[PDB]
PDB file of C-alpha atoms and ligand atoms in Angstrom:
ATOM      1  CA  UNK A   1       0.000   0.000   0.000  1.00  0.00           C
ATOM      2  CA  UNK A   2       0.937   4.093   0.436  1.00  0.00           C
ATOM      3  CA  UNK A   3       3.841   4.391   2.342  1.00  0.00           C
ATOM      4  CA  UNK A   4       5.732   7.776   3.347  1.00  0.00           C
ATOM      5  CA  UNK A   5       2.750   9.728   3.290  1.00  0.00           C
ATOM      6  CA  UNK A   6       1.577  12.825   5.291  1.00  0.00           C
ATOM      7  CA  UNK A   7      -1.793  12.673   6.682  1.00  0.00           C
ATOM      8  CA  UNK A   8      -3.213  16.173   5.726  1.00  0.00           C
ATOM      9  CA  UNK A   9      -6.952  15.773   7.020  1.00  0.00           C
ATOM     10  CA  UNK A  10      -9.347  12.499   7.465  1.00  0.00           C
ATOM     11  CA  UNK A  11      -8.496  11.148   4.015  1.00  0.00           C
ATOM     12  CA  UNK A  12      -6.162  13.474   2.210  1.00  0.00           C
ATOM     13  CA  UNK A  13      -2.315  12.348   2.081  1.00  0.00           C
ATOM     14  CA  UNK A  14       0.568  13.971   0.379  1.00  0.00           C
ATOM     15  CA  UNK A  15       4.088  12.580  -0.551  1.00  0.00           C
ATOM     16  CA  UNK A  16       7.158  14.404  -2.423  1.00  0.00           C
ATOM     17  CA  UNK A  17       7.088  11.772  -5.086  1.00  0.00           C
ATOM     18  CA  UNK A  18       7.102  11.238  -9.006  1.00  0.00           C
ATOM     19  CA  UNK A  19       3.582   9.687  -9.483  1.00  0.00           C
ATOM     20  CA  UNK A  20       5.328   7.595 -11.937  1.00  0.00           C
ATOM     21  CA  UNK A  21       7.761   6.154 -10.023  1.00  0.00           C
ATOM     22  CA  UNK A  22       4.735   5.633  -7.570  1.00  0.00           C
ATOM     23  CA  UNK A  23       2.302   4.282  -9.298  1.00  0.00           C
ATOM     24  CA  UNK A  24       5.090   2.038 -10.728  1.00  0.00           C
ATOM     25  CA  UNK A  25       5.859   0.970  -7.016  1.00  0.00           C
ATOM     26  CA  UNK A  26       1.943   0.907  -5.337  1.00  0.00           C
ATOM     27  CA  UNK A  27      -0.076  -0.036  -8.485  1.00  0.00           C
ATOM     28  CA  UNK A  28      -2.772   1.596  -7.203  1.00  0.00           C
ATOM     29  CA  UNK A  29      -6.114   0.876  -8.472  1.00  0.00           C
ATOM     30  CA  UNK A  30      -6.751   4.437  -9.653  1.00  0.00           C
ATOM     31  CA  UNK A  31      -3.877   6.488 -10.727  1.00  0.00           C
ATOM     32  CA  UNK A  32      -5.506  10.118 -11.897  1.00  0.00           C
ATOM     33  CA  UNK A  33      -4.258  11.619 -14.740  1.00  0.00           C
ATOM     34  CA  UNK A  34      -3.637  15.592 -15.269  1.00  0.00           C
ATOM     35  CA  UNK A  35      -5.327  15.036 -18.414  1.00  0.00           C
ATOM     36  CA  UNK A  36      -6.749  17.756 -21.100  1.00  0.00           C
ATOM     37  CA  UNK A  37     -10.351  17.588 -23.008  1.00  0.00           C
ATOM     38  CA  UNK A  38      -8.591  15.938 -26.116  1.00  0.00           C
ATOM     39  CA  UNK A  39      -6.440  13.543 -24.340  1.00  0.00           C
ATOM     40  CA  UNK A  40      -3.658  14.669 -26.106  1.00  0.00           C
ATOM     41  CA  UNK A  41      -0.447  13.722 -23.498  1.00  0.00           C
ATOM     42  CA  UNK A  42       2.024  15.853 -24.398  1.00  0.00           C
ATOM     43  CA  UNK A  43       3.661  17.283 -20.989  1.00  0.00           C
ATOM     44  CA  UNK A  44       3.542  17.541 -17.486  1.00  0.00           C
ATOM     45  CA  UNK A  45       1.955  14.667 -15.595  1.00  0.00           C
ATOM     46  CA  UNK A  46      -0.229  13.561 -18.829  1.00  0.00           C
ATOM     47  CA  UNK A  47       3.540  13.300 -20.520  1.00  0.00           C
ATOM     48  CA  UNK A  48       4.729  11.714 -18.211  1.00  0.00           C
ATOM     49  CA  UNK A  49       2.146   8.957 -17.211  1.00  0.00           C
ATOM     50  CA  UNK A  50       1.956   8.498 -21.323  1.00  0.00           C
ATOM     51  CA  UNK A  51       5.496   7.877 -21.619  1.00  0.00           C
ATOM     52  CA  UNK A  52       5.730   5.419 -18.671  1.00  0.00           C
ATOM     53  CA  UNK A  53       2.871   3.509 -20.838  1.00  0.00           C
ATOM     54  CA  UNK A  54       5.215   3.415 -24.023  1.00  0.00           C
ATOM     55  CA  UNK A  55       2.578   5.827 -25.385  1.00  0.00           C
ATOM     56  CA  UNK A  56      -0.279   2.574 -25.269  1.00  0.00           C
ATOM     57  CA  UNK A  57      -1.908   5.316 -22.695  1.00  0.00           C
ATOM     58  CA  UNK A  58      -2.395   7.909 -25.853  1.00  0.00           C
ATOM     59  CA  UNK A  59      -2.976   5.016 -28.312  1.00  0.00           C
ATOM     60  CA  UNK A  60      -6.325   4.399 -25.968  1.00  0.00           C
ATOM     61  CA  UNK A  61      -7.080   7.907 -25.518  1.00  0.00           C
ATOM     62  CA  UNK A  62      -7.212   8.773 -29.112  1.00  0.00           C
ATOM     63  CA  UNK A  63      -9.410   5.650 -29.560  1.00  0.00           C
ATOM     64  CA  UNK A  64     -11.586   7.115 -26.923  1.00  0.00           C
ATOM     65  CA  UNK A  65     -11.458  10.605 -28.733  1.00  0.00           C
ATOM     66  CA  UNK A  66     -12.556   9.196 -31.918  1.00  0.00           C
ATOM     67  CA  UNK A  67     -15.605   7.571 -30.829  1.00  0.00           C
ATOM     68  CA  UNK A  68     -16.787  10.126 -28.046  1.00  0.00           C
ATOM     69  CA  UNK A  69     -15.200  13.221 -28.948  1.00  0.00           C
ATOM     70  CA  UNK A  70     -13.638  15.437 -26.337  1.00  0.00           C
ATOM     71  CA  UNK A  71     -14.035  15.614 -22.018  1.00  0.00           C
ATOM     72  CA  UNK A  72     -15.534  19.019 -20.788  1.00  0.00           C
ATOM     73  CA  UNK A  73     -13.446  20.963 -18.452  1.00  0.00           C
ATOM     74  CA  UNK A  74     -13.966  19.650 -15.044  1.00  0.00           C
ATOM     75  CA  UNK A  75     -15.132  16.406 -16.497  1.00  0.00           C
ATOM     76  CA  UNK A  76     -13.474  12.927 -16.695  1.00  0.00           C
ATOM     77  CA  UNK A  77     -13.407   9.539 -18.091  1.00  0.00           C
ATOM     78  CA  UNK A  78     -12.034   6.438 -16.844  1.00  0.00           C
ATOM     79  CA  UNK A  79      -9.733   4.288 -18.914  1.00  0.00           C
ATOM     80  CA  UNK A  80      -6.759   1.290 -18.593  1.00  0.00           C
ATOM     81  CA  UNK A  81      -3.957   2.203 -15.754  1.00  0.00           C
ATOM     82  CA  UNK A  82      -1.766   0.028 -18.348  1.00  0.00           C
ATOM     83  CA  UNK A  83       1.743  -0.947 -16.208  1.00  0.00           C
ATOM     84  CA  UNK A  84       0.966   1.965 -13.818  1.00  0.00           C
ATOM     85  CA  UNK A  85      -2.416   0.963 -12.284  1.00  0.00           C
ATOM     86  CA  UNK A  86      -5.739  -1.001 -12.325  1.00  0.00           C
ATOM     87  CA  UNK A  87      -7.282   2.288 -13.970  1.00  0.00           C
ATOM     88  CA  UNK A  88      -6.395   6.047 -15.158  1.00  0.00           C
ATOM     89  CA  UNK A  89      -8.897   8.361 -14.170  1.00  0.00           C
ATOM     90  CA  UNK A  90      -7.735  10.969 -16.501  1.00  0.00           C
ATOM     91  CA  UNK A  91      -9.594  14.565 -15.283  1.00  0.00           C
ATOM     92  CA  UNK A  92      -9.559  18.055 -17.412  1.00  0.00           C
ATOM     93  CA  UNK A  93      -8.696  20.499 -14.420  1.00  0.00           C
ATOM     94  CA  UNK A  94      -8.845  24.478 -15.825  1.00  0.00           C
ATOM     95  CA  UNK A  95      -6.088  25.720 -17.486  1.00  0.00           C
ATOM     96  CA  UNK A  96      -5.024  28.933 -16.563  1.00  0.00           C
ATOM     97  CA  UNK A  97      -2.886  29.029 -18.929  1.00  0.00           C
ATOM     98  CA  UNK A  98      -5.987  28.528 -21.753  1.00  0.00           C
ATOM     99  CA  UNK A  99      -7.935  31.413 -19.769  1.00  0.00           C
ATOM    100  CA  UNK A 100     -10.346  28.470 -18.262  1.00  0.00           C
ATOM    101  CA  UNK A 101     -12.470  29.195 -15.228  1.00  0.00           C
ATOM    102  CA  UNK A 102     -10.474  28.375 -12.127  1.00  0.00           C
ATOM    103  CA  UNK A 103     -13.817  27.696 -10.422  1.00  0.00           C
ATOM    104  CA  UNK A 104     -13.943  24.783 -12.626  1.00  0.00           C
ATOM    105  CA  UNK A 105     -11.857  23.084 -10.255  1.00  0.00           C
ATOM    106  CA  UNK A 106     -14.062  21.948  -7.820  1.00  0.00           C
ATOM    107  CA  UNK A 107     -16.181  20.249 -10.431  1.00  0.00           C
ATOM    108  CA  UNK A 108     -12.789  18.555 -11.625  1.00  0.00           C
ATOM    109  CA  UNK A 109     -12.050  17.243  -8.254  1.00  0.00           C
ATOM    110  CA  UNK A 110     -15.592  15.880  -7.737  1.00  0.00           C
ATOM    111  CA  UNK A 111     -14.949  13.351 -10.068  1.00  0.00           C
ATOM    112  CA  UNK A 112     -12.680  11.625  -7.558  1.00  0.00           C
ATOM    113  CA  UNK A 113     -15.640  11.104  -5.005  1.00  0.00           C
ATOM    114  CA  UNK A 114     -16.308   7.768  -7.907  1.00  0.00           C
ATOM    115  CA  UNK A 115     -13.264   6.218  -6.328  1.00  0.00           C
ATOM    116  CA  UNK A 116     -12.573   5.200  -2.747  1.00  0.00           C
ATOM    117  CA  UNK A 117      -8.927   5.529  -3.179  1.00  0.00           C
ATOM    118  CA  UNK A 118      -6.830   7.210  -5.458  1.00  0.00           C
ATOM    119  CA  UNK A 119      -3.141   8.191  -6.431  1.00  0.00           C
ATOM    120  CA  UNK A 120      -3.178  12.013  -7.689  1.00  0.00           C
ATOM    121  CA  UNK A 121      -1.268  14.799  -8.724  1.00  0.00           C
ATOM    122  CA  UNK A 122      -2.393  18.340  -7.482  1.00  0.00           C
ATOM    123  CA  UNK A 123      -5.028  19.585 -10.202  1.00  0.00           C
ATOM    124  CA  UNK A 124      -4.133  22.665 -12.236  1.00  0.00           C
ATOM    125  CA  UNK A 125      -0.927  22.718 -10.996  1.00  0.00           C
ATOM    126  CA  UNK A 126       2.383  22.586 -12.652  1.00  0.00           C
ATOM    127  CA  UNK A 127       1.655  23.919 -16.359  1.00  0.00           C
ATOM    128  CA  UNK A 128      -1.723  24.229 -16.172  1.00  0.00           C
ATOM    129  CA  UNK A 129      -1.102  27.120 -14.227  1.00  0.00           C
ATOM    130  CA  UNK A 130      -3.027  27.353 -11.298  1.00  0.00           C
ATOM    131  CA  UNK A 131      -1.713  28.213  -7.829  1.00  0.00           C
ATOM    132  CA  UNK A 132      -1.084  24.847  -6.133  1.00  0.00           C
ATOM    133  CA  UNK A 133      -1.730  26.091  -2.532  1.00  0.00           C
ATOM    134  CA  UNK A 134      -5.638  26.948  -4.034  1.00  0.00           C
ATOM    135  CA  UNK A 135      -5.632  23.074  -5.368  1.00  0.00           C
ATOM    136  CA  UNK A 136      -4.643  21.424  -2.516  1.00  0.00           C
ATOM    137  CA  UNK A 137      -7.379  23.520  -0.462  1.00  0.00           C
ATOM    138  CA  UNK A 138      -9.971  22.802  -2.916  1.00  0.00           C
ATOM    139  CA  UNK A 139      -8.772  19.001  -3.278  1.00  0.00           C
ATOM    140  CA  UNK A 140      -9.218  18.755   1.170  1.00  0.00           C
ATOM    141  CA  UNK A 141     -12.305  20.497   0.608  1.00  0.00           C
ATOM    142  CA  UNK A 142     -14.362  18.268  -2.410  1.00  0.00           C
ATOM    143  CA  UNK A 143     -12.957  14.903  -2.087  1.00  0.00           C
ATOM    144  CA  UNK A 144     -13.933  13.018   0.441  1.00  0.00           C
ATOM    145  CA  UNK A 145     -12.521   9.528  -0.420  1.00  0.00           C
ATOM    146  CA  UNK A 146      -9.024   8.309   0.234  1.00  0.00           C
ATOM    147  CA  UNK A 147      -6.558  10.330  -2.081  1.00  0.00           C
ATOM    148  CA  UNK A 148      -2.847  10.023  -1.643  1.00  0.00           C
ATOM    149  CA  UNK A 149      -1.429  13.463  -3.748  1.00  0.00           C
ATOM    150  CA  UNK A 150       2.440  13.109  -5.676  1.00  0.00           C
ATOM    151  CA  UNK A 151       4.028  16.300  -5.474  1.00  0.00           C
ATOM    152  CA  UNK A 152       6.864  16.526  -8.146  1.00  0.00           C
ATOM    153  CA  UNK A 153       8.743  19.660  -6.720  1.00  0.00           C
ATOM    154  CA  UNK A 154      10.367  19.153  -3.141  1.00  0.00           C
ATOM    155  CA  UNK A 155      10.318  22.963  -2.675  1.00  0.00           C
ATOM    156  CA  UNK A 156       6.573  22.903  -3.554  1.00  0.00           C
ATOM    157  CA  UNK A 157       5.597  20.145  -1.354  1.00  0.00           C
ATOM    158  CA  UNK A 158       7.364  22.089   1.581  1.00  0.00           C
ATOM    159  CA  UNK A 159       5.866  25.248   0.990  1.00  0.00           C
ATOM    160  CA  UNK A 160       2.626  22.949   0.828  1.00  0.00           C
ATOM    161  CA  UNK A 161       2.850  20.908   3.804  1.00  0.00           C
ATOM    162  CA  UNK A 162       4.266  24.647   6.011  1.00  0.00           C
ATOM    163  CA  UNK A 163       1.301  26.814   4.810  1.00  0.00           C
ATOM    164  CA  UNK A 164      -1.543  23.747   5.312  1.00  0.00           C
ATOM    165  CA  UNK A 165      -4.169  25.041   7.275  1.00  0.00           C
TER     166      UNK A 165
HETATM  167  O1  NXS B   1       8.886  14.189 -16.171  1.00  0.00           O
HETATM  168  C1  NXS B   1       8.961  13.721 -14.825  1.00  0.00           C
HETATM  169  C2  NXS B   1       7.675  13.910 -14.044  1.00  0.00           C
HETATM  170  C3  NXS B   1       6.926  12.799 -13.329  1.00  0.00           C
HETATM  171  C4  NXS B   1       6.465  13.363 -11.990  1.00  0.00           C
HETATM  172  N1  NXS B   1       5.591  14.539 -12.118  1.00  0.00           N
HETATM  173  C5  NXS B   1       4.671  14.839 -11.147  1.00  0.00           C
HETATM  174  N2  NXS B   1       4.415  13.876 -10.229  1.00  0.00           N
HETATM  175  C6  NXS B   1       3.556  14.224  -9.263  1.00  0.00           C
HETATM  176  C7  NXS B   1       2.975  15.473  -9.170  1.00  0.00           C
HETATM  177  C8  NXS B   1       3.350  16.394 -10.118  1.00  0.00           C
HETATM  178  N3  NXS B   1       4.182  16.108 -11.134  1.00  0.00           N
HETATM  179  C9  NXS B   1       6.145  15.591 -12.982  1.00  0.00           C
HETATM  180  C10 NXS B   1       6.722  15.072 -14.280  1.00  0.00           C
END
């Protein structure tokens, strides 16, 4: 199971880790994916995952694409975890970056309530462009199942864990 974790609240946990190299190690049965609406993996924690898969994760998503066209921001869909999980719940946080409503976030992390336990990377963080300090507060506050948050960035996990309220 999760190991090395920090126990934020009742059932949020957070770890300086590579959600690869975790989900590699735990196998969880949901890994979430910092996916976009066209599934298109390209960077960041969607680039990543997708290259841990040998790209098989982006050969399913644009399967997916084809026959159901894209997610809506703050939506989700789930498909194969391939070598890194059971499943990939890949979820279209706002990009701030793509002028998206931030408020859209909440929605985004709602779709984890589906799942009693997940692995997950902050939402809108990284280059999506949110603040991840607003994430992690809206991630305690929506999700009420077990999720067990990766944070890439040492110096960003710190500044997380020191400014929790
Ligand atoms: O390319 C190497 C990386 C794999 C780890 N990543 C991550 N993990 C957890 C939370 C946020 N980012 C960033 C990309």
């Amino acid at each position: 199971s999760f190991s090395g974790y920090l126990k934020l609240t009742d059932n949020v946990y957070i770890k300086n880790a590579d959600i690869v190299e975790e989900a590699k190690k735990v196998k969880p049965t949901v890994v979430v994916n910092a996916a976009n609406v066209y599934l298109k993996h390209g960077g960041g924690v969607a680039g990543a995952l997708n290259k841990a898969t040998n790209n098989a994760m982006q050969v399913e998503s644009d399967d997916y694409i084809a026959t159901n066209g894209p997610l809506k921001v703050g939506g989700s869909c789930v498909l194969s975890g391939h070598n890194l999980a059971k499943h990939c719940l890949h979820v279209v946080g706002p990009n701030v970056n793509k002028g998206e409503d931030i408020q859209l976030l909440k929605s985004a992390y709602e779709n984890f309530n589906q799942h009693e336990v997940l692995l997950a990377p902050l939402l809108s963080a990284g280059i999506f462009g949110a603040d991840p300090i607003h994430s992690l507060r809206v991630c305690v506050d929506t999700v009420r199942t077990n999720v067990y948050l990766a944070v890439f960035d040492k110096n960003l996990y710190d500044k997380l864990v020191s400014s929790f309220l």
